[PDB]
Amino acid sequence: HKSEVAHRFKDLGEENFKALVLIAFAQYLQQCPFEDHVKLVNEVTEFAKTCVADESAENCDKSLHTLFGDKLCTVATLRETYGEMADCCAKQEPERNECFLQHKDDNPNLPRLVRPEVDVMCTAFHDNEETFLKKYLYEIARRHPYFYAPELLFFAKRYKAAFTECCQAADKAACLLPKLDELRDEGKASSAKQRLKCASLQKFGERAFKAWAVARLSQRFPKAEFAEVSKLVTDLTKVHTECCHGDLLECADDRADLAKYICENQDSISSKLKECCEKPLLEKSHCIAEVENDEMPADLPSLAADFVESKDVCKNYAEAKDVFLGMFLYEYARRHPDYSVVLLLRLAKTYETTLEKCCAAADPHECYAKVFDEFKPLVEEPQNLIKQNCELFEQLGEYKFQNALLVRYTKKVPQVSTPTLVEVSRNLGKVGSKCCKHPEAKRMPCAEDYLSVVLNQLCVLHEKTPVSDRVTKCCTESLVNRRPCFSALEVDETYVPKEFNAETFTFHADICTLSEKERQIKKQTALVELVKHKPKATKEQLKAVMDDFAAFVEKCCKADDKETCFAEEGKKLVAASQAAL
Template identity: 40%
Template sequence: MKWVTFISFLFLASLAASKHLPRRYRHAGHQDTIAQATEVTPDEFRGIALVISSQALQQATYEEVSKVKNDIVELQKKCAADEKSDPECTKPLGTVFLDEICHEQEIIAKYGFADCCAKVDPERKDCILAHKNGTQGFIPPFQKPSAEEGCKAFEADPDQTMGRYVYEIARRYPFSKTSSIFAGARKYKEVLTTCCKEADKDACFAEKATEVSKYLRKEFARQKQICSVHRKLGEVPLQALKVALISQKFPKADFPTVLKLSADIVHAYTECCKGDTLECLLDRADVSKYVCSHQATLSSKVHDCCEKSLLEQGDCIAHSENDDKPADLSPTVREFIDNKEVCQHYADNHTLHQAKFVHEYGRRHPELSPELLVRLGKGYGDLLEKCCALENVVECLGHGEAELKKHISDTLEVVKKNCELHATAGDYLFQNELLVRYTKKAPQLTFDQLYEYTKGLTKAAAKCCHEDEAHKLPCAEKYVSFVLGEICREHEIHHINKQVCKCCGDSLTFRRECFSGLGPDPEYEPTPFASDLFTFHPDLCTADPEVLKRKKQKQLVDLIKHKPTITDEQLAGVIVDFQGMMTQCCEVADHKTCFETEGPKLIERTRTAFGES
């Protein structure tokens, strides 16, 4: 679908005169300046300056970055007091940040920015952004202080401690949103405030600081996934999903507004993905301001978000509940089915008509996932291609409507079956089932990778299967899409196989269906049998239960990699045989001798069952 085409068309045709257009659509002379940076508090502006400087000067020391940050803050104070006090006061904010970096001659010479600073914008800006490196390990791993040392530093100078924390995070994630780093810093400050009062500081930090790290890793992973999709598939799939999601979140919003917001949000993604995190921040702030100034026509659910600081509004709005459907909204979208004129609308602009369908269907069905809505939009387009070539258009569309409804019911049935399996099997056996499936699909992945991905899918089932019917499907598709996105990011770095490549590269919204349809990799050469492939140690009888579970899962994966075409019956037989050996050997005093005797017998029986002996 040519989403870029219709969004551009709609902006030119319908929104060009809007006084509410974001900054990039306004007159070129109207831009954010440092003198206007009063919409955030002084502390927030200092934080922004620190984040942007740390992300640009990744290899610089904290002291060097602080020098740049302090100069920017002082300039902002000066310009706020008198906009005519310095020529920098009326320059675009992004230009001022680059000017301040390039004024530091020693720093730019030391870290290789001299050539960039000799250029003029936009070449200067592009050059500096091109230096950003988000590769893991580019900045050495952070050496965490002990709990005691961290608390002493925090008590002595809270601002310095938090500043260093923000600096260390920002320089390692130069493409990440400022708001995510701020959110992580707020959470970490709460950890310091709480844990430094505890007698057992180490235990407190081990629990609470780990949660902050998990939060940040997931946030950054999600942002990297967006950039991966943007890099490989462009803005199209991201805009399509946003149209669906915003239609559900703001069902009162009219179609042009939904398109406007979706384009604005994806444009912010584009800026962050190319490393222009300041422009990304400003774009997101514009979206927040627009939403908060149009609450009456958009949503009654964002009031509390709009009471927060500008830096917190965006993420809060993104996670806000869907607004209630308008009372006068018709229950169905018959105008897209019972109307011959739809063919003319479709002929006039294919993608615009499909987008209207997604919008109208989405605002009526918050219980469906955005991914499913986009798939329905694609199905509706295919239906029009078929029916509009026939004489009995309405009759054909009526039959086709049943196909769209079947796709919805099929999707819900997949979720239902997986939830039933999870309810019956529990987390451990459910994950084992997923390990079998995904080892067959992608045997090139290591056990640790397969374990983490299937653990993520198991957590999705544990969380989403307990949701009510209004939230179950959106929850499931969201979390499953995240895990599949992580697999695709891994594939982008290290090629997995051709069938995974196809699923990752063809369609974002059909990705889950594609992965579900994969069988054993046809080009995979199974791991040859070796005597040490399956080893049975006495610690199988004495290991911690969780450790033992993982050991068994490792052997399960090794077995599938050796025999990816194994049938369910063969696998069940091997598992029963293995459990029997475990019971037998763990009941005798000499575990070691028993395993040495019975282990080879088990292997031989297994190979015979596989037709290998």
């Protein structure tokens, strides 16, 4: 293209162009104030307008990396605010762009964004929809300089949807805050999810990533030929490789190219893409990333003929080990959208170990002709765990199910800080709430999707402050054994009971005057501490004081006097509890 900026401006449109320019600059100049970014956007935007009017116009033939880097090196305060980053301006492309890339600062030190009151928010939204919305877009991008820009744009449009609706409703806050809590959860999860793929790719290498992609792409497009899945796995591996490196434009072009290939070859891939493929370039690769699985072809054969009977197993394996294993993964995954990806990786690795053991032995076929028996226990384990836990979740509430998780995980690893124990148990409990309302045909992918983002981010929090050798051993091992390792943790019988502290189990009337959530957290915080102080307490014994405490609060949080019921009756509850434990 004669002018890449004019071309982008025509592909995306003025509104999307401006928003992505803002995110781009907010992710590099993370301490410049919001109003100078607006100046940069308006300046880049009306320059781009000269380029769509005339592509021979001055500077319109420069590359976007050049144009972007040029804009960065005109910030007058660049060396005084970003210091060493300003020295990038003395290099030339592509060294300069790489130098700027290196100087992206993850985890900068900005105050946390405090959600204001609903009436404050709706009033700001009404008084200046754009400035309000773009300011929050800027606040989030500067605090997440590696969050892929278009997805951030796609979250911004969903926030706009939440405000327009709820700022008009009768009970504003009742409409808005759940939507805002929901959006925060996904954006935080997506941020965690991107950094996990990009950190297992280097921890574990291209091969393991390719193995994961074959499984995932085969469940999604089970009518595609394995040659087509392998083509897609290759392009997709390059795409995540390049996107992990951090160049937003080089990353965006790889994604857009892959989506153009997929949309051009739908009838070799899937019948579900005609709408996504009709969508504009900015949304094309996103839409297809989250499209639902295509229907499996009717009455596929068993995997027996190709992978256990056929005399050419060991010979076809040796001819190309990974391609043969990759074919096995393809055939198993396409038949099993109900499995998690990691389970399919367990099976494939299981098939790999026995093929490696039997293809070197006398009469291989005898040695390995039963390996499909080895798959059954590996399949029951995730399913069993889902059943019992989804069963328990509908026996108890969401909140009481959290309290069940709370007791169990505290007993397994009582060294974890109380607040971290509460947050994980509350979150896991949320995962029963959404995943357990799926049928068994789609429960295991649901759990995997959510556990993975609860598991390694408790592991990144654990590498921050290690407290147990067993949770580092879980967290530093394969992503296929991550969830089993944690499931295999047993009640810590090394632990020394925490010394009784009276202030930890003293309660006041403020507890009546707190929100349901904030009341549950403090109820759940005391429960962790109770299990830490008397860890040999049984759930029968624990239920008895939990019932007592429940009655205690409902008594003192309703009497004529309150501040004194909580100390007088409170003193009784404690003493009666210590006696029973």
